[PDB]
Each structure stands twice: as structure tokens, then as C-alpha cells.
């Protein structure tokens, strides 16, 4: 799975040419701030499908796979 800088850091190059392997893409910072968990979930899922071009995603929950609550973790198609 290749994703863009925009996917990973939130801004930058648009084309999907960053290799992340077989795991999730870390969309840094997409779940930061004071919005509700539901609203953050929507922002994250749409960043994942619309920018990372994955199937969906979810905010960090402290697990090994999704360790940072401020980050959004996107799954491939």
C-alpha cells in the first residue's frame, strides 16, 4: 500500500508514493482536539478513505496497533 504525504502528515505532496507495508497508515494528528469521539471518528474515517484511499480508519485507543489517541489509523482496501 502506497499513500501520500497528505495522508501521513496531513499536508504536503498529493500523489500516493509512500510505502507503509502491510499494516495501518498513521494519519498523524487527525484525532487531536476537543471534538466528540464520534466527530473525530468521522473525520478519521473520511481522511482514511478520501485522502489515504483506504477502506476506513479509527482514532488511537492506546493499543499497540493504535497507540496515540491524537492519531488516526487507516486500513488499506
Numbering used by the authors: 1 to 77
Cite, word for word, the article reporting this structure.
In this study, we describe the structure and function of a highly specific ion channel blocker from the salivary gland of X. cheopis, which belongs to the FS family and has been given the name FS50. The FS family of peptides is unique to fleas and has been identified from the salivary glands of the rat flea Xenopsylla cheopis (Rots) and the cat flea Ctenocephalides felis. FS proteins contain six to eight conserved cysteine residues forming three or four disulfide bonds and show relatively weak similarity to scorpion toxins. In this study we have shown that FS50, a salivary component of the rat flea, is a blocker of the sodium channel NaV1.5 that is capable of protecting rats and monkeys from barium chloride-induced arrhythmias.
FS50 contains a cysteine-stabilized core βαββ structure having a general similarity to that found in the scorpion β toxins. The protein also contains a second domain made up of a small βαβ structure that is connected to the core domain through a coil region. While a second domain (the NC-globule) found in scorpion β-toxins is made up of elements both N- and C-terminal to the core domain, the βαβ domain of FS50 is comprised only of a long N-terminal extension. In the second domain, the α-helix and two-stranded antiparallel β-sheet are formed by residues 5–9, residues 1–3, and residues 17–21, respectively. A fourth disulfide bridge between Cys 7 and Cys 52 connects the two domains. Notably, the loop connecting β-strands 1 and 2 of the core domain is elongated and folded back over the core domain β-sheet. Along with the βαβ domain, this arrangement produces a somewhat flattened surface unlike the protruding C-terminal sequence seen in the scorpion toxins. From its structure, it would appear that the binding mode of FS50 is unlike that of the scorpion toxins, and outside of general similarities in their overall folds, the two types of proteins probably function differently.
